[PDB]
PDB file of all heavy atoms in Angstrom:
ATOM      1  N   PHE A  77      -2.157   2.522   9.719  1.00  0.00           N
ATOM      2  CA  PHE A  77      -2.981   2.351  10.912  1.00  0.00           C
ATOM      3  C   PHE A  77      -2.958   3.560  11.850  1.00  0.00           C
ATOM      4  O   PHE A  77      -3.980   3.920  12.427  1.00  0.00           O
ATOM      5  CB  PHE A  77      -2.609   1.069  11.659  1.00  0.00           C
ATOM      6  CG  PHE A  77      -3.018  -0.185  10.943  1.00  0.00           C
ATOM      7  CD1 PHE A  77      -2.093  -1.175  10.664  1.00  0.00           C
ATOM      8  CD2 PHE A  77      -4.332  -0.372  10.549  1.00  0.00           C
ATOM      9  CE1 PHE A  77      -2.469  -2.328  10.004  1.00  0.00           C
ATOM     10  CE2 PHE A  77      -4.715  -1.521   9.886  1.00  0.00           C
ATOM     11  CZ  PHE A  77      -3.782  -2.502   9.615  1.00  0.00           C
ATOM     12  N   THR A  78      -1.789   4.171  12.013  1.00  0.00           N
ATOM     13  CA  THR A  78      -1.642   5.320  12.909  1.00  0.00           C
ATOM     14  C   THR A  78      -1.841   6.716  12.305  1.00  0.00           C
ATOM     15  O   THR A  78      -1.781   7.707  13.028  1.00  0.00           O
ATOM     16  CB  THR A  78      -0.292   5.283  13.655  1.00  0.00           C
ATOM     17  OG1 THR A  78       0.778   5.170  12.711  1.00  0.00           O
ATOM     18  CG2 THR A  78      -0.248   4.101  14.605  1.00  0.00           C
ATOM     19  N   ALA A  79      -2.067   6.808  10.999  1.00  0.00           N
ATOM     20  CA  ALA A  79      -2.228   8.120  10.372  1.00  0.00           C
ATOM     21  C   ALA A  79      -3.471   8.835  10.899  1.00  0.00           C
ATOM     22  O   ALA A  79      -4.542   8.241  10.998  1.00  0.00           O
ATOM     23  CB  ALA A  79      -2.294   7.980   8.860  1.00  0.00           C
ATOM     24  N   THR A  80      -3.323  10.118  11.222  1.00  0.00           N
ATOM     25  CA  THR A  80      -4.428  10.919  11.748  1.00  0.00           C
ATOM     26  C   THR A  80      -5.186  11.701  10.678  1.00  0.00           C
ATOM     27  O   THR A  80      -6.171  12.370  10.975  1.00  0.00           O
ATOM     28  CB  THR A  80      -3.943  11.912  12.822  1.00  0.00           C
ATOM     29  OG1 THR A  80      -3.042  12.857  12.233  1.00  0.00           O
ATOM     30  CG2 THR A  80      -3.237  11.181  13.945  1.00  0.00           C
ATOM     31  N   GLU A  81      -4.727  11.610   9.437  1.00  0.00           N
ATOM     32  CA  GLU A  81      -5.351  12.329   8.333  1.00  0.00           C
ATOM     33  C   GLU A  81      -5.896  11.345   7.307  1.00  0.00           C
ATOM     34  O   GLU A  81      -5.235  10.367   6.964  1.00  0.00           O
ATOM     35  CB  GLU A  81      -4.345  13.288   7.691  1.00  0.00           C
ATOM     36  CG  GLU A  81      -4.947  14.578   7.159  1.00  0.00           C
ATOM     37  CD  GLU A  81      -5.303  14.504   5.687  1.00  0.00           C
ATOM     38  OE1 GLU A  81      -4.820  13.582   5.001  1.00  0.00           O
ATOM     39  OE2 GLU A  81      -6.061  15.375   5.213  1.00  0.00           O
ATOM     40  N   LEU A  82      -7.108  11.600   6.825  1.00  0.00           N
ATOM     41  CA  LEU A  82      -7.737  10.718   5.848  1.00  0.00           C
ATOM     42  C   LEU A  82      -6.949  10.631   4.544  1.00  0.00           C
ATOM     43  O   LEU A  82      -6.848   9.557   3.955  1.00  0.00           O
ATOM     44  CB  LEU A  82      -9.184  11.137   5.580  1.00  0.00           C
ATOM     45  CG  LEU A  82     -10.187  10.724   6.657  1.00  0.00           C
ATOM     46  CD1 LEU A  82     -11.597  11.145   6.276  1.00  0.00           C
ATOM     47  CD2 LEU A  82     -10.120   9.224   6.888  1.00  0.00           C
ATOM     48  N   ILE A  83      -6.405  11.753   4.084  1.00  0.00           N
ATOM     49  CA  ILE A  83      -5.616  11.744   2.855  1.00  0.00           C
ATOM     50  C   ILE A  83      -4.311  10.970   3.038  1.00  0.00           C
ATOM     51  O   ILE A  83      -3.885  10.242   2.146  1.00  0.00           O
ATOM     52  CB  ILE A  83      -5.345  13.160   2.314  1.00  0.00           C
ATOM     53  CG1 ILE A  83      -6.573  13.680   1.571  1.00  0.00           C
ATOM     54  CG2 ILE A  83      -4.154  13.151   1.371  1.00  0.00           C
ATOM     55  CD1 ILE A  83      -6.940  12.854   0.358  1.00  0.00           C
ATOM     56  N   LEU A  84      -3.675  11.135   4.195  1.00  0.00           N
ATOM     57  CA  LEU A  84      -2.437  10.422   4.486  1.00  0.00           C
ATOM     58  C   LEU A  84      -2.746   8.931   4.498  1.00  0.00           C
ATOM     59  O   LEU A  84      -2.013   8.125   3.933  1.00  0.00           O
ATOM     60  CB  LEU A  84      -1.860  10.861   5.829  1.00  0.00           C
ATOM     61  CG  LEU A  84      -0.500  10.270   6.201  1.00  0.00           C
ATOM     62  CD1 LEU A  84       0.528  10.558   5.120  1.00  0.00           C
ATOM     63  CD2 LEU A  84      -0.033  10.799   7.547  1.00  0.00           C
ATOM     64  N   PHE A  85      -3.844   8.582   5.159  1.00  0.00           N
ATOM     65  CA  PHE A  85      -4.319   7.207   5.231  1.00  0.00           C
ATOM     66  C   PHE A  85      -4.551   6.638   3.841  1.00  0.00           C
ATOM     67  O   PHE A  85      -4.165   5.503   3.562  1.00  0.00           O
ATOM     68  CB  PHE A  85      -5.600   7.136   6.065  1.00  0.00           C
ATOM     69  CG  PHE A  85      -6.320   5.822   5.961  1.00  0.00           C
ATOM     70  CD1 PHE A  85      -5.908   4.733   6.703  1.00  0.00           C
ATOM     71  CD2 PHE A  85      -7.406   5.676   5.116  1.00  0.00           C
ATOM     72  CE1 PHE A  85      -6.560   3.523   6.604  1.00  0.00           C
ATOM     73  CE2 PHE A  85      -8.060   4.468   5.015  1.00  0.00           C
ATOM     74  CZ  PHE A  85      -7.636   3.391   5.761  1.00  0.00           C
ATOM     75  N   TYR A  86      -5.172   7.417   2.952  1.00  0.00           N
ATOM     76  CA  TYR A  86      -5.402   6.961   1.585  1.00  0.00           C
ATOM     77  C   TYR A  86      -4.087   6.692   0.860  1.00  0.00           C
ATOM     78  O   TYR A  86      -3.946   5.678   0.165  1.00  0.00           O
ATOM     79  CB  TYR A  86      -6.234   7.997   0.827  1.00  0.00           C
ATOM     80  CG  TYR A  86      -6.448   7.667  -0.634  1.00  0.00           C
ATOM     81  CD1 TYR A  86      -7.502   6.864  -1.035  1.00  0.00           C
ATOM     82  CD2 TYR A  86      -5.589   8.157  -1.610  1.00  0.00           C
ATOM     83  CE1 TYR A  86      -7.695   6.554  -2.360  1.00  0.00           C
ATOM     84  CE2 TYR A  86      -5.772   7.850  -2.936  1.00  0.00           C
ATOM     85  CZ  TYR A  86      -6.829   7.049  -3.307  1.00  0.00           C
ATOM     86  OH  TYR A  86      -7.020   6.743  -4.633  1.00  0.00           O
ATOM     87  N   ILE A  87      -3.117   7.592   1.014  1.00  0.00           N
ATOM     88  CA  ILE A  87      -1.847   7.455   0.307  1.00  0.00           C
ATOM     89  C   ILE A  87      -1.118   6.192   0.748  1.00  0.00           C
ATOM     90  O   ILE A  87      -0.615   5.431  -0.083  1.00  0.00           O
ATOM     91  CB  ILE A  87      -0.984   8.714   0.508  1.00  0.00           C
ATOM     92  CG1 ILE A  87      -1.504   9.855  -0.365  1.00  0.00           C
ATOM     93  CG2 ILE A  87       0.471   8.429   0.183  1.00  0.00           C
ATOM     94  CD1 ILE A  87      -0.711  11.130  -0.234  1.00  0.00           C
ATOM     95  N   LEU A  88      -1.063   5.933   2.057  1.00  0.00           N
ATOM     96  CA  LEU A  88      -0.369   4.732   2.524  1.00  0.00           C
ATOM     97  C   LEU A  88      -1.175   3.466   2.238  1.00  0.00           C
ATOM     98  O   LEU A  88      -0.607   2.405   1.937  1.00  0.00           O
ATOM     99  CB  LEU A  88      -0.070   4.858   4.013  1.00  0.00           C
ATOM    100  CG  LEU A  88       0.809   6.040   4.414  1.00  0.00           C
ATOM    101  CD1 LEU A  88       0.374   6.603   5.757  1.00  0.00           C
ATOM    102  CD2 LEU A  88       2.264   5.615   4.445  1.00  0.00           C
ATOM    103  N   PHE A  89      -2.497   3.578   2.323  1.00  0.00           N
ATOM    104  CA  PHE A  89      -3.421   2.500   2.008  1.00  0.00           C
ATOM    105  C   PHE A  89      -3.260   2.035   0.568  1.00  0.00           C
ATOM    106  O   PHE A  89      -3.400   0.841   0.280  1.00  0.00           O
ATOM    107  CB  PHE A  89      -4.825   3.039   2.305  1.00  0.00           C
ATOM    108  CG  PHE A  89      -5.955   2.165   1.880  1.00  0.00           C
ATOM    109  CD1 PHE A  89      -6.281   1.029   2.592  1.00  0.00           C
ATOM    110  CD2 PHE A  89      -6.746   2.529   0.806  1.00  0.00           C
ATOM    111  CE1 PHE A  89      -7.350   0.250   2.214  1.00  0.00           C
ATOM    112  CE2 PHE A  89      -7.808   1.754   0.421  1.00  0.00           C
ATOM    113  CZ  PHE A  89      -8.116   0.618   1.128  1.00  0.00           C
ATOM    114  N   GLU A  90      -2.960   2.958  -0.344  1.00  0.00           N
ATOM    115  CA  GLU A  90      -2.597   2.600  -1.711  1.00  0.00           C
ATOM    116  C   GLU A  90      -1.141   2.190  -1.861  1.00  0.00           C
ATOM    117  O   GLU A  90      -0.834   1.336  -2.698  1.00  0.00           O
ATOM    118  CB  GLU A  90      -2.895   3.762  -2.657  1.00  0.00           C
ATOM    119  CG  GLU A  90      -4.091   3.521  -3.537  1.00  0.00           C
ATOM    120  CD  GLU A  90      -5.364   3.408  -2.746  1.00  0.00           C
ATOM    121  OE1 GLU A  90      -5.499   4.107  -1.722  1.00  0.00           O
ATOM    122  OE2 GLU A  90      -6.215   2.589  -3.132  1.00  0.00           O
ATOM    123  N   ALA A  91      -0.236   2.781  -1.081  1.00  0.00           N
ATOM    124  CA  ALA A  91       1.172   2.411  -1.161  1.00  0.00           C
ATOM    125  C   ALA A  91       1.388   0.950  -0.804  1.00  0.00           C
ATOM    126  O   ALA A  91       2.353   0.337  -1.271  1.00  0.00           O
ATOM    127  CB  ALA A  91       2.003   3.312  -0.250  1.00  0.00           C
ATOM    128  N   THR A  92       0.505   0.375   0.015  1.00  0.00           N
ATOM    129  CA  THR A  92       0.626  -1.046   0.334  1.00  0.00           C
ATOM    130  C   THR A  92       0.463  -1.948  -0.886  1.00  0.00           C
ATOM    131  O   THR A  92       0.831  -3.126  -0.814  1.00  0.00           O
ATOM    132  CB  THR A  92      -0.401  -1.466   1.391  1.00  0.00           C
ATOM    133  OG1 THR A  92      -1.725  -1.241   0.894  1.00  0.00           O
ATOM    134  CG2 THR A  92      -0.198  -0.694   2.678  1.00  0.00           C
ATOM    135  N   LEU A  93      -0.072  -1.433  -1.995  1.00  0.00           N
ATOM    136  CA  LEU A  93      -0.326  -2.254  -3.176  1.00  0.00           C
ATOM    137  C   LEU A  93       0.946  -2.667  -3.909  1.00  0.00           C
ATOM    138  O   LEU A  93       1.043  -3.813  -4.356  1.00  0.00           O
ATOM    139  CB  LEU A  93      -1.242  -1.507  -4.145  1.00  0.00           C
ATOM    140  CG  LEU A  93      -2.678  -1.997  -4.311  1.00  0.00           C
ATOM    141  CD1 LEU A  93      -3.373  -2.152  -2.967  1.00  0.00           C
ATOM    142  CD2 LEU A  93      -3.448  -1.042  -5.209  1.00  0.00           C
ATOM    143  N   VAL A  94       1.908  -1.763  -4.059  1.00  0.00           N
ATOM    144  CA  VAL A  94       3.073  -1.999  -4.914  1.00  0.00           C
ATOM    145  C   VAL A  94       3.924  -3.164  -4.408  1.00  0.00           C
ATOM    146  O   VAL A  94       4.251  -4.061  -5.204  1.00  0.00           O
ATOM    147  CB  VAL A  94       3.910  -0.715  -5.063  1.00  0.00           C
ATOM    148  CG1 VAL A  94       5.178  -0.993  -5.840  1.00  0.00           C
ATOM    149  CG2 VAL A  94       3.098   0.376  -5.733  1.00  0.00           C
ATOM    150  N   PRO A  95       4.320  -3.208  -3.125  1.00  0.00           N
ATOM    151  CA  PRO A  95       5.087  -4.379  -2.664  1.00  0.00           C
ATOM    152  C   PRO A  95       4.341  -5.690  -2.833  1.00  0.00           C
ATOM    153  O   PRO A  95       4.946  -6.692  -3.227  1.00  0.00           O
ATOM    154  CB  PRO A  95       5.348  -4.069  -1.186  1.00  0.00           C
ATOM    155  CG  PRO A  95       5.240  -2.616  -1.068  1.00  0.00           C
ATOM    156  CD  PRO A  95       4.253  -2.165  -2.084  1.00  0.00           C
ATOM    157  N   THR A  96       3.035  -5.704  -2.558  1.00  0.00           N
ATOM    158  CA  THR A  96       2.261  -6.935  -2.688  1.00  0.00           C
ATOM    159  C   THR A  96       2.195  -7.392  -4.135  1.00  0.00           C
ATOM    160  O   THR A  96       2.331  -8.585  -4.427  1.00  0.00           O
ATOM    161  CB  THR A  96       0.853  -6.728  -2.133  1.00  0.00           C
ATOM    162  OG1 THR A  96       0.920  -5.916  -0.956  1.00  0.00           O
ATOM    163  CG2 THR A  96       0.213  -8.062  -1.790  1.00  0.00           C
ATOM    164  N   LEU A  97       1.979  -6.453  -5.055  1.00  0.00           N
ATOM    165  CA  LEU A  97       1.931  -6.788  -6.472  1.00  0.00           C
ATOM    166  C   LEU A  97       3.267  -7.338  -6.954  1.00  0.00           C
ATOM    167  O   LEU A  97       3.308  -8.330  -7.693  1.00  0.00           O
ATOM    168  CB  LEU A  97       1.532  -5.548  -7.268  1.00  0.00           C
ATOM    169  CG  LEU A  97       1.460  -5.613  -8.788  1.00  0.00           C
ATOM    170  CD1 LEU A  97       0.176  -6.281  -9.227  1.00  0.00           C
ATOM    171  CD2 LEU A  97       1.553  -4.209  -9.336  1.00  0.00           C
ATOM    172  N   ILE A  98       4.371  -6.713  -6.537  1.00  0.00           N
ATOM    173  CA  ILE A  98       5.688  -7.206  -6.930  1.00  0.00           C
ATOM    174  C   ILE A  98       5.925  -8.603  -6.367  1.00  0.00           C
ATOM    175  O   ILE A  98       6.418  -9.495  -7.068  1.00  0.00           O
ATOM    176  CB  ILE A  98       6.782  -6.218  -6.487  1.00  0.00           C
ATOM    177  CG1 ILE A  98       6.712  -4.943  -7.326  1.00  0.00           C
ATOM    178  CG2 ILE A  98       8.157  -6.852  -6.597  1.00  0.00           C
ATOM    179  CD1 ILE A  98       7.546  -3.809  -6.784  1.00  0.00           C
ATOM    180  N   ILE A  99       5.567  -8.819  -5.099  1.00  0.00           N
ATOM    181  CA  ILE A  99       5.766 -10.124  -4.475  1.00  0.00           C
ATOM    182  C   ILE A  99       4.960 -11.194  -5.202  1.00  0.00           C
ATOM    183  O   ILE A  99       5.455 -12.298  -5.457  1.00  0.00           O
ATOM    184  CB  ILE A  99       5.407 -10.062  -2.979  1.00  0.00           C
ATOM    185  CG1 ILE A  99       6.478  -9.298  -2.201  1.00  0.00           C
ATOM    186  CG2 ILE A  99       5.235 -11.453  -2.402  1.00  0.00           C
ATOM    187  CD1 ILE A  99       5.985  -8.719  -0.894  1.00  0.00           C
ATOM    188  N   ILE A 100       3.712 -10.884  -5.553  1.00  0.00           N
ATOM    189  CA  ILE A 100       2.856 -11.872  -6.200  1.00  0.00           C
ATOM    190  C   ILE A 100       3.368 -12.199  -7.598  1.00  0.00           C
ATOM    191  O   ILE A 100       3.496 -13.370  -7.969  1.00  0.00           O
ATOM    192  CB  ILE A 100       1.398 -11.382  -6.236  1.00  0.00           C
ATOM    193  CG1 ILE A 100       0.765 -11.478  -4.851  1.00  0.00           C
ATOM    194  CG2 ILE A 100       0.587 -12.197  -7.229  1.00  0.00           C
ATOM    195  CD1 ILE A 100      -0.529 -10.716  -4.725  1.00  0.00           C
ATOM    196  N   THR A 101       3.670 -11.174  -8.397  1.00  0.00           N
ATOM    197  CA  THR A 101       3.978 -11.397  -9.803  1.00  0.00           C
ATOM    198  C   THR A 101       5.437 -11.744 -10.067  1.00  0.00           C
ATOM    199  O   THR A 101       5.761 -12.159 -11.183  1.00  0.00           O
ATOM    200  CB  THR A 101       3.599 -10.169 -10.635  1.00  0.00           C
ATOM    201  OG1 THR A 101       4.079  -8.983  -9.993  1.00  0.00           O
ATOM    202  CG2 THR A 101       2.093 -10.082 -10.784  1.00  0.00           C
ATOM    203  N   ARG A 102       6.324 -11.591  -9.086  1.00  0.00           N
ATOM    204  CA  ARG A 102       7.734 -11.905  -9.279  1.00  0.00           C
ATOM    205  C   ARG A 102       8.107 -13.264  -8.693  1.00  0.00           C
ATOM    206  O   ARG A 102       8.776 -14.062  -9.352  1.00  0.00           O
ATOM    207  CB  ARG A 102       8.602 -10.794  -8.677  1.00  0.00           C
ATOM    208  CG  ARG A 102      10.093 -11.052  -8.747  1.00  0.00           C
ATOM    209  CD  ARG A 102      10.624 -11.035 -10.161  1.00  0.00           C
ATOM    210  NE  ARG A 102      12.041 -11.371 -10.185  1.00  0.00           N
ATOM    211  CZ  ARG A 102      12.745 -11.601 -11.284  1.00  0.00           C
ATOM    212  NH1 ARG A 102      12.197 -11.524 -12.484  1.00  0.00           N
ATOM    213  NH2 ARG A 102      14.032 -11.914 -11.176  1.00  0.00           N
ATOM    214  N   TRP A 103       7.680 -13.545  -7.467  1.00  0.00           N
ATOM    215  CA  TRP A 103       8.072 -14.785  -6.795  1.00  0.00           C
ATOM    216  C   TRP A 103       6.930 -15.793  -6.714  1.00  0.00           C
ATOM    217  O   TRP A 103       7.023 -16.795  -6.009  1.00  0.00           O
ATOM    218  CB  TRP A 103       8.627 -14.475  -5.412  1.00  0.00           C
ATOM    219  CG  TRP A 103       9.985 -13.847  -5.443  1.00  0.00           C
ATOM    220  CD1 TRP A 103      11.179 -14.495  -5.526  1.00  0.00           C
ATOM    221  CD2 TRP A 103      10.290 -12.450  -5.373  1.00  0.00           C
ATOM    222  NE1 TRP A 103      12.209 -13.591  -5.522  1.00  0.00           N
ATOM    223  CE2 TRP A 103      11.690 -12.327  -5.428  1.00  0.00           C
ATOM    224  CE3 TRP A 103       9.515 -11.293  -5.273  1.00  0.00           C
ATOM    225  CZ2 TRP A 103      12.332 -11.095  -5.386  1.00  0.00           C
ATOM    226  CZ3 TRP A 103      10.153 -10.074  -5.233  1.00  0.00           C
ATOM    227  CH2 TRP A 103      11.548  -9.983  -5.288  1.00  0.00           C
ATOM    228  N   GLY A 104       5.848 -15.550  -7.441  1.00  0.00           N
ATOM    229  CA  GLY A 104       4.766 -16.514  -7.583  1.00  0.00           C
ATOM    230  C   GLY A 104       5.237 -17.670  -8.448  1.00  0.00           C
ATOM    231  O   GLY A 104       6.208 -17.537  -9.192  1.00  0.00           O
TER     232      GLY A 104
END
């Protein structure tokens, strides 16, 4: 949310995927 660079924003915007995927497929 606070990143001032579009590329930085993209990297963190994708980094949010891994924890969610692990949470869904492990403790589902």
Side-chain angles (χ1 to χ4, degrees):
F77 289 126
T78 54
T80 64
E81 214 266 344
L82 282 182
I83 281 298
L84 185 56
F85 168 81
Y86 176 87
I87 284 180
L88 300 144
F89 172 75
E90 253 64 35
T92 61
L93 251 51
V94 175
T96 321
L97 178 79
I98 290 168
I99 287 157
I100 286 166
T101 47
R102 177 67 184 171
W103 287 275

